[PDB]
């Protein structure tokens, strides 16, 4: 309200391509966490419920990053069988 306007969350359109500008803006707001934040703020999330959600989201990140690390580590072994027939 007290800040300058047309600086925050503003993307310029290139060659009249408004779809790519909107997708870029939506990608910006998602990566910064604003979209999920706006949605979670529609109804009041009680603190006990917020702590449970954050715990669940943090344990999922650890599991998902650890499973991804194992997939990338083992992906080289997806090559053809060197000892076929034995």
């Amino acid at each position: 309200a007290k800040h300058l306007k047309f600086i925050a969350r503003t993307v310029m359109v290139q060659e009249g391509n408004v779809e790519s500008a909107y997708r870029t803006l939506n990608r910006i707001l998602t990566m910064d966490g604003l979209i999920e934040d706006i949605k979670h703020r529609r109804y009041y999330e009680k603190p006990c419920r917020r702590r449970q959600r954050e715990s669940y989201e943090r344990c999922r990140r650890i599991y998902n990053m650890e499973m991804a690390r194992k997939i990338n580590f083992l992906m080289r072994k997806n090559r053809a069988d060197p000892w076929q027939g034995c």
Partner: protein, 137 residues
Amino acid sequence: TKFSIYPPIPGEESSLRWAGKKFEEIPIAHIKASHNNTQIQVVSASNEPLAFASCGTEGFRNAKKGTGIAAQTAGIAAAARAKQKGVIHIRVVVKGLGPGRLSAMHGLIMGGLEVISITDNTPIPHXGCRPRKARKL
């Protein structure tokens, strides 16, 4: 020169122009995309209203207002009244994550207006008023 997605900063000397007008002089299309309605107001850079349209003013009622095609129709209506007043290029400022957030912008383009920038102004309180309690469904 390479394309910059960052808007030109007022007071600095930019070379970008739209019909001989600077970014600071382009009218603004304010799109309020609510969950049950979409309101579009086109204003001049000096805050002069030029056109207003919403899904309710376009003959949509109740749950039909909260749809994409309803917002698209509201955009076309506002674009038509704005084009008559001399508007071609507009800066879009959209607040809200309703279904007419993107569809309202399509209607502005189909109505003959050129969108040069998109700004999100969805209100996010930094800590603010307590929202209503969750729903049991």
